[PDB]
Short mmCIF file of C-alpha atoms and ligand atoms in Angstrom, two decimals:
data_model
loop_
_atom_site.label_atom_id
_atom_site.label_comp_id
_atom_site.label_asym_id
_atom_site.label_seq_id
_atom_site.Cartn_x
_atom_site.Cartn_y
_atom_site.Cartn_z
CA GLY B 12 5.84 17.30 32.55
CA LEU B 13 4.27 18.43 29.18
CA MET B 14 6.21 21.80 29.44
CA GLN B 15 8.97 22.02 26.76
CA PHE B 16 11.34 24.96 26.52
CA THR B 17 11.34 26.15 22.88
CA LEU B 18 13.70 28.69 21.38
CA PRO B 19 13.19 31.13 18.53
CA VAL B 20 13.88 29.51 15.13
CA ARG B 21 17.40 30.91 14.56
CA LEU B 22 18.50 29.63 18.06
CA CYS B 23 16.61 26.31 17.77
CA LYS B 24 18.71 25.64 14.60
CA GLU B 25 22.08 27.20 15.52
CA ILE B 26 22.15 25.75 19.12
CA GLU B 27 22.76 22.29 17.51
CA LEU B 28 26.00 23.58 15.91
CA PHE B 29 29.35 23.53 17.72
CA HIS B 30 30.10 27.22 16.96
CA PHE B 31 26.81 28.56 18.47
CA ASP B 32 27.26 31.77 20.53
CA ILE B 33 24.68 32.01 23.36
CA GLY B 34 24.20 35.77 22.70
CA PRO B 35 24.21 38.90 24.92
CA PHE B 36 20.70 38.40 26.51
CA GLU B 37 21.72 36.96 29.93
CA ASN B 38 18.02 36.37 30.80
CA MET B 39 17.83 33.76 28.00
CA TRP B 40 20.85 31.65 29.24
CA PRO B 41 18.91 29.65 31.92
CA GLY B 42 16.27 28.79 29.29
CA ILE B 43 18.99 27.77 26.78
CA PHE B 44 20.57 25.47 29.45
CA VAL B 45 17.22 23.83 30.36
CA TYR B 46 16.51 23.36 26.61
CA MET B 47 19.87 21.56 26.26
CA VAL B 48 19.27 19.37 29.36
CA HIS B 49 15.80 18.42 28.02
CA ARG B 50 17.14 17.38 24.56
CA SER B 51 20.45 15.89 25.86
CA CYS B 52 19.10 14.03 28.90
CA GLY B 53 15.25 14.10 28.79
CA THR B 54 12.40 16.24 30.26
CA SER B 55 12.33 13.56 33.09
CA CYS B 56 16.08 13.84 34.11
CA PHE B 57 15.40 16.65 36.63
CA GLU B 58 12.36 18.10 38.43
CA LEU B 59 11.94 21.45 36.55
CA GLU B 60 11.44 23.50 39.79
CA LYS B 61 14.59 22.02 41.46
CA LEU B 62 16.57 22.43 38.18
CA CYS B 63 15.52 26.15 37.89
CA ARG B 64 16.37 26.79 41.55
CA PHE B 65 19.73 24.98 40.99
CA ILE B 66 20.61 27.05 37.81
CA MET B 67 19.76 30.35 39.55
CA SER B 68 21.89 29.50 42.63
CA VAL B 69 24.76 28.49 40.27
CA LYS B 70 24.38 31.80 38.40
CA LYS B 71 24.49 33.76 41.69
CA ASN B 72 27.78 31.99 42.71
CA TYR B 73 29.59 33.12 39.52
CA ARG B 74 31.30 36.53 39.89
CA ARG B 75 31.25 39.63 37.62
CA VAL B 76 34.76 38.96 36.27
CA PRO B 77 35.54 39.59 32.58
CA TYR B 78 35.83 35.94 31.39
CA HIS B 79 35.33 33.27 34.19
CA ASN B 80 31.65 34.30 34.53
CA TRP B 81 28.16 32.88 34.12
CA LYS B 82 28.39 33.35 30.28
CA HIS B 83 31.53 31.10 30.26
CA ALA B 84 29.61 28.49 32.34
CA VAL B 85 26.74 28.30 29.86
CA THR B 86 29.06 28.46 26.83
CA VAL B 87 31.08 25.46 28.15
CA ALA B 88 27.80 23.55 28.80
CA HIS B 89 26.64 24.28 25.20
CA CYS B 90 29.89 22.78 23.76
CA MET B 91 29.27 19.66 25.92
CA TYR B 92 25.64 19.58 24.69
CA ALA B 93 26.90 19.63 21.04
CA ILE B 94 29.44 16.82 21.78
CA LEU B 95 26.73 14.69 23.49
CA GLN B 96 24.13 15.33 20.74
CA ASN B 97 26.65 14.31 17.99
CA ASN B 98 27.55 11.08 20.00
CA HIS B 99 24.00 9.89 20.91
CA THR B 100 24.88 6.29 21.86
CA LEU B 101 28.41 6.60 23.44
CA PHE B 102 27.32 7.95 26.87
CA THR B 103 25.35 6.54 29.81
CA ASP B 104 22.20 8.11 31.32
CA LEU B 105 24.26 9.27 34.40
CA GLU B 106 27.01 10.74 32.15
CA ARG B 107 24.44 12.85 30.22
CA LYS B 108 22.99 14.09 33.60
CA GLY B 109 26.39 14.75 35.21
CA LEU B 110 28.41 16.39 32.39
CA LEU B 111 26.05 19.36 31.56
CA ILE B 112 25.85 20.08 35.30
CA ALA B 113 29.67 19.63 35.59
CA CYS B 114 30.13 22.16 32.77
CA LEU B 115 27.64 24.70 34.28
CA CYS B 116 29.44 24.36 37.66
CA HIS B 117 33.05 23.95 36.49
CA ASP B 118 34.25 27.54 37.33
CA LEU B 119 31.87 28.26 40.25
CA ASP B 120 33.04 31.24 42.38
CA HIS B 121 36.05 31.92 40.13
CA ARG B 122 37.86 35.15 41.11
CA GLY B 123 39.57 35.74 37.72
CA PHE B 124 42.92 34.44 39.05
CA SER B 125 45.01 31.33 38.19
CA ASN B 126 46.08 28.56 40.62
CA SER B 127 49.63 30.08 40.33
CA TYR B 128 48.40 33.50 41.52
CA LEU B 129 46.53 31.99 44.57
CA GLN B 130 49.76 30.04 45.48
CA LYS B 131 51.99 33.17 45.14
CA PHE B 132 49.44 35.26 47.06
CA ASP B 133 49.29 32.49 49.74
CA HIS B 134 45.42 32.46 49.45
CA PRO B 135 43.69 30.25 52.11
CA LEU B 136 42.41 28.03 49.21
CA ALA B 137 46.08 27.18 48.27
CA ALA B 138 46.54 25.74 51.84
CA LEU B 139 43.19 23.87 51.65
CA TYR B 140 43.93 22.43 48.11
CA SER B 141 47.62 22.12 47.15
CA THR B 142 46.98 21.17 43.48
CA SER B 143 44.11 22.00 41.11
CA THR B 144 43.36 24.71 43.72
CA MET B 145 40.45 26.52 42.01
CA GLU B 146 39.03 23.27 40.54
CA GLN B 147 38.71 21.57 43.99
CA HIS B 148 37.00 24.82 45.10
CA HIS B 149 34.58 24.73 42.11
CA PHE B 150 33.68 21.09 43.00
CA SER B 151 33.19 22.14 46.69
CA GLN B 152 30.85 25.02 45.61
CA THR B 153 28.93 22.52 43.38
CA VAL B 154 28.37 20.12 46.35
CA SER B 155 27.36 23.17 48.59
CA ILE B 156 24.69 24.28 46.09
CA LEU B 157 23.40 20.66 45.57
CA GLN B 158 22.94 20.55 49.40
CA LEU B 159 20.79 23.73 49.65
CA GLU B 160 17.14 22.90 50.45
CA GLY B 161 15.11 22.26 47.24
CA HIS B 162 18.35 22.24 45.08
CA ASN B 163 18.94 18.47 44.98
CA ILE B 164 18.39 17.79 41.27
CA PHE B 165 19.73 14.24 41.79
CA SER B 166 17.21 13.35 44.61
CA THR B 167 15.51 10.54 42.55
CA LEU B 168 18.90 8.71 42.03
CA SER B 169 19.82 5.71 44.27
CA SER B 170 22.61 6.12 46.86
CA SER B 171 25.19 4.46 44.50
CA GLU B 172 23.96 6.28 41.33
CA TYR B 173 24.17 9.58 43.29
CA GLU B 174 27.77 8.64 44.29
CA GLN B 175 28.56 7.79 40.64
CA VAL B 176 27.14 11.09 39.19
CA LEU B 177 28.96 13.22 41.90
CA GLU B 178 32.13 11.29 41.00
CA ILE B 179 31.61 11.98 37.24
CA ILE B 180 31.19 15.73 38.12
CA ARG B 181 34.25 15.80 40.42
CA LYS B 182 36.61 14.21 37.86
CA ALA B 183 35.11 16.37 35.04
CA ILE B 184 35.66 19.59 37.03
CA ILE B 185 39.21 18.58 38.17
CA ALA B 186 40.03 17.76 34.47
CA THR B 187 39.46 21.51 33.62
CA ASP B 188 42.78 22.22 35.40
CA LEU B 189 44.80 22.73 32.19
CA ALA B 190 48.00 21.57 34.13
CA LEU B 191 46.41 18.04 33.97
CA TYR B 192 45.37 18.24 30.26
CA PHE B 193 48.91 17.64 28.74
CA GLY B 194 49.50 14.27 30.44
CA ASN B 195 45.86 13.25 29.94
CA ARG B 196 46.03 13.89 26.17
CA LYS B 197 49.51 12.16 25.80
CA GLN B 198 48.05 9.03 27.45
CA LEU B 199 44.94 9.22 25.21
CA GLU B 200 47.26 9.70 22.13
CA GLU B 201 49.33 6.54 23.09
CA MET B 202 46.17 4.51 23.90
CA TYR B 203 44.45 5.43 20.57
CA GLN B 204 47.60 4.76 18.43
CA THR B 205 48.50 1.36 20.07
CA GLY B 206 44.77 0.45 19.82
CA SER B 207 44.43 -0.13 23.62
CA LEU B 208 41.68 2.60 24.02
CA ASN B 209 38.68 0.77 25.54
CA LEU B 210 35.46 2.75 26.32
CA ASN B 211 34.27 -0.16 28.61
CA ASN B 212 37.35 0.53 30.81
CA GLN B 213 36.19 3.13 33.39
CA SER B 214 39.74 4.65 33.75
CA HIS B 215 39.63 5.13 29.92
CA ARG B 216 36.12 6.72 29.97
CA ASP B 217 37.43 9.06 32.72
CA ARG B 218 40.34 10.14 30.45
CA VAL B 219 38.02 10.72 27.44
CA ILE B 220 35.58 12.78 29.61
CA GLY B 221 38.57 14.80 30.84
CA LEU B 222 39.55 15.62 27.24
CA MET B 223 35.88 16.55 26.43
CA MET B 224 36.05 18.93 29.49
CA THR B 225 39.25 20.57 28.15
CA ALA B 226 37.64 20.77 24.66
CA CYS B 227 34.46 22.43 26.04
CA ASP B 228 36.48 24.67 28.41
CA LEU B 229 38.66 25.96 25.52
CA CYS B 230 35.69 26.21 23.06
CA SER B 231 36.24 30.04 22.61
CA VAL B 232 38.89 29.01 20.00
CA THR B 233 36.24 26.97 18.07
CA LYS B 234 33.77 29.85 17.45
CA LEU B 235 33.49 32.01 14.33
CA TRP B 236 36.46 34.41 14.16
CA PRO B 237 34.55 37.57 15.33
CA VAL B 238 33.41 35.67 18.52
CA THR B 239 36.91 34.22 19.12
CA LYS B 240 38.58 37.61 18.65
CA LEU B 241 36.16 39.48 21.02
CA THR B 242 36.31 36.66 23.63
CA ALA B 243 40.17 36.96 23.59
CA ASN B 244 39.70 40.58 24.92
CA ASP B 245 37.84 39.21 28.01
CA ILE B 246 40.45 36.43 28.50
CA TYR B 247 43.31 38.97 28.37
CA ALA B 248 41.41 41.48 30.61
CA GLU B 249 41.64 38.82 33.40
CA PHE B 250 45.24 37.79 32.60
CA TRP B 251 46.45 41.43 32.57
CA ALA B 252 44.71 42.14 35.95
CA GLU B 253 46.44 38.98 37.32
CA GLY B 254 49.69 40.38 35.84
CA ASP B 255 49.09 43.70 37.64
CA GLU B 256 48.51 41.75 40.93
CA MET B 257 51.76 39.76 40.34
CA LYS B 258 53.54 43.15 39.97
CA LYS B 259 51.95 44.20 43.32
CA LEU B 260 53.52 41.08 44.93
CA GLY B 261 56.97 42.15 43.43
CA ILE B 262 56.87 39.35 40.75
CA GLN B 263 57.31 40.04 36.99
CA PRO B 264 54.31 38.18 35.51
CA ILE B 265 54.72 35.87 32.47
CA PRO B 266 54.32 37.91 29.21
CA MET B 267 50.75 36.42 28.60
CA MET B 268 49.75 38.38 31.78
CA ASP B 269 51.74 41.59 31.16
CA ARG B 270 49.61 44.45 29.69
CA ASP B 271 52.95 46.13 28.69
CA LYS B 272 53.47 43.16 26.28
CA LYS B 273 50.17 43.36 24.24
CA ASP B 274 52.35 43.16 21.03
CA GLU B 275 53.33 39.50 21.93
CA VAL B 276 49.60 38.39 21.99
CA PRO B 277 49.38 37.24 18.32
CA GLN B 278 52.54 35.01 18.71
CA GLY B 279 51.27 33.76 22.13
CA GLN B 280 47.94 32.74 20.49
CA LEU B 281 49.86 30.65 17.82
CA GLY B 282 51.76 28.84 20.66
CA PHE B 283 48.44 28.15 22.40
CA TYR B 284 46.75 26.88 19.22
CA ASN B 285 49.80 24.69 18.33
CA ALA B 286 50.61 23.41 21.89
CA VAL B 287 47.08 23.10 23.42
CA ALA B 288 43.99 23.72 21.27
CA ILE B 289 44.82 21.88 17.97
CA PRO B 290 46.28 18.81 19.76
CA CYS B 291 43.19 18.80 22.08
CA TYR B 292 40.61 18.80 19.22
CA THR B 293 42.79 16.39 17.09
CA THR B 294 42.82 13.69 19.83
CA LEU B 295 39.11 14.39 20.52
CA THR B 296 38.35 13.97 16.79
CA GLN B 297 40.33 10.66 16.74
CA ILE B 298 38.29 9.29 19.69
CA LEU B 299 34.93 10.92 18.76
CA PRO B 300 34.87 11.51 14.99
CA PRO B 301 31.65 13.62 14.93
CA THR B 302 33.50 16.38 16.99
CA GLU B 303 35.58 17.15 13.86
CA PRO B 304 33.82 20.55 13.34
CA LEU B 305 35.59 21.76 16.58
CA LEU B 306 39.03 20.93 15.06
CA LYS B 307 38.11 22.56 11.70
CA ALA B 308 36.88 25.73 13.53
CA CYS B 309 40.06 25.75 15.68
CA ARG B 310 42.27 25.46 12.56
CA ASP B 311 40.28 28.33 10.92
CA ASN B 312 41.01 30.57 13.97
CA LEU B 313 44.69 29.52 13.92
CA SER B 314 44.77 30.76 10.30
CA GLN B 315 43.08 34.07 11.37
CA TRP B 316 45.80 34.68 14.08
CA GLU B 317 48.45 33.91 11.44
CA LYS B 318 46.83 36.69 9.30
CA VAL B 319 46.96 39.10 12.28
CA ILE B 320 50.77 38.55 12.55
CA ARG B 321 51.14 39.17 8.72
CA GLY B 322 49.40 42.59 9.29
CA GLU B 323 46.47 41.36 7.05
CA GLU B 324 44.44 42.43 10.20
C1 J7M Y 1 50.05 30.99 25.81
N1 J7M Y 1 49.75 32.37 25.60
C2 J7M Y 1 48.44 32.91 25.31
C3 J7M Y 1 47.27 32.05 25.36
C4 J7M Y 1 45.95 32.66 25.58
N2 J7M Y 1 44.95 31.78 26.01
C5 J7M Y 1 45.32 30.80 27.02
C6 J7M Y 1 44.41 30.25 28.08
O1 J7M Y 1 43.10 30.77 28.21
C7 J7M Y 1 42.30 30.49 27.12
C8 J7M Y 1 41.18 29.71 27.46
C9 J7M Y 1 40.34 29.39 26.40
C10 J7M Y 1 40.58 29.84 25.08
C11 J7M Y 1 41.69 30.63 24.78
C12 J7M Y 1 42.57 30.95 25.80
C13 J7M Y 1 43.71 31.84 25.39
O2 J7M Y 1 43.50 32.67 24.49
N3 J7M Y 1 48.42 34.27 25.08
C14 J7M Y 1 49.78 34.67 25.19
C15 J7M Y 1 50.37 35.96 25.06
C16 J7M Y 1 51.76 36.05 25.27
C17 J7M Y 1 52.56 34.90 25.60
C18 J7M Y 1 52.04 33.61 25.76
C19 J7M Y 1 50.63 33.48 25.56
MG1 MG Y 2 38.54 26.69 35.46
ZN1 ZN Y 3 36.41 27.29 32.48
#
């Protein structure tokens, strides 16, 4: 009850910033997560022993893939922590509980392969979940872990509050399917610009949480350039392995996934910044002005990729 997590001074200060990198010491990531829950939610939100058992079972159900790993989980939760801390009064008690957990769980049991690859492979999960294949899986793994003995971090909630938090988590995890991001953001753009955006409308809150989930999920592009650049290596290490596996199925992969087309990476990053990232953080900044540092950091990294194409690096 009286037991705070405390971080060294440099982390205590930098963890509050959007561009914080959680560092290479894996053993400190559980502690960093608990710290963020305690400041974001309260020391009373979860029973410490249940929360610790929950975190460690989540960690175990992430795989040793180059990018969609336990470090991604905690990184995406930190971006959500920074959004929630900069927007103190906009979110409910259940939202604060649900969203950090949603972010920690959002890529549970990821194999390093896209929905497209599972569908072309004819993976059993593509028969069980026809759209948002991996995301329905990640939600299913989240419910499985919550149901392990001593892992029910929500046990003090009422039956209807429990249903509400699991519903926040489900929609938040489904929203990380980038296929769903484009339509979600277009609707949020129209709603904001015609002035119809209403944060008391649940269907509107759902849309805004979805965009937050995309923003946190993509937050590699909002880090300082040396972090962004080195993270891109891990992202492409998965895509190129998927590309190799497409070639094994007799299917030319898209260029993004073809290791023979490394030279097209700088132009592909520009497309991604211009079509996905910048528009994502722009609409987020319009709805939640204190998230502007994410857009600024994203624009700085766009300018760094432009310099790579100009052979300035
Ligand atoms: C479109 N696109 C990309 C985008 C890469 N990408 C896309 C999705 O994964 C991410 C998730 C979070 C943050 C960044 C990324 C990222 O770097 N690289 C490419 C190379 C050739 C052709 C098209 C390409
Ligand atoms: Mg995912
Ligand atoms: Zn993710």
